[PDB]
Design a protein around this ligand. Sequence first.
Ligand SMILES: CCOP(=O)(COc1ccc(C[C@H](NC(=O)O[C@H]2CO[C@H]3OCC[C@H]32)[C@H](O)CN(CC(CC)CC)S(=O)(=O)c2ccc(N)cc2)cc1)OCC
Lengths: 99, 99
Amino acid sequence: PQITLWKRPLVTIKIGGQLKEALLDTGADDTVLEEMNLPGRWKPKMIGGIGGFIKVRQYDQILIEICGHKAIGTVLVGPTPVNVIGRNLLTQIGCTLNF
Amino acid sequence: PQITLWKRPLVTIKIGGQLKEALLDTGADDTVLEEMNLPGRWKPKMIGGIGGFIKVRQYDQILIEICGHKAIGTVLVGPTPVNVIGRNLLTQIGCTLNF
Ligand SMILES: CCOP(=O)(COc1ccc(C[C@H](NC(=O)O[C@H]2CO[C@H]3OCC[C@H]32)[C@H](O)CN(CC(CC)CC)S(=O)(=O)c2ccc(N)cc2)cc1)OCC
């Protein structure tokens, strides 16, 4: 699809059997979801945003379907203000910026 | 043009007669730029993301040129670790997400 930006670019995602809403975020290197239960091993990690750093759980090689397009990659879970899909997965679904 | 997301979508902008580099950021509601002492009146604002909030100065009806595309709108100035072109100006240059 082609998505304009007059509203937040929110899409439905499927992860770990659950549907969620997430923001397509070209300014995010990484994908960060709010607190949730994900099956799999995880490592503690730190990530930095506009306001400083937070502690997250890093899940690797996680299947996630974004607006009908499948990706398998790293998902960070922690106190992010909103679910964001970052470039690590945006590249997998073939997402580009166009103007 | 079309910008893939393998790397940060950094572009040159022109604002207040100065050239800067900024991210095209679909996750940013509003444009936020590094400290720069623009003339005119402004309004205090707080913007939040990963890690919390920072204090910024809101200027309205500021002209920015983004890869030759002119736009005019709100620009927030403050101690941001990165310059981001947000949706308020990305719409004006006709920028879309596509996959
Ligand atoms: C102290 C740390 O220092 P740094 O490491 C941080 O640098 C940064 C690099 C890019 C960004 C941009 C930010 N990306 C982000 O948070 O991504 C994180 C996960 O992926 C990695 O990749 C980069 C960072 C992490 C979002 O696109 C936009 N945000 C909102 C978004 C939705 C609510 C928040 C999830 S917003 O908060 O910025 C914002 C809020 C209100 C506005 N009107 C305008 C902007 C911010 C900081 O830099 C050192 C020089």
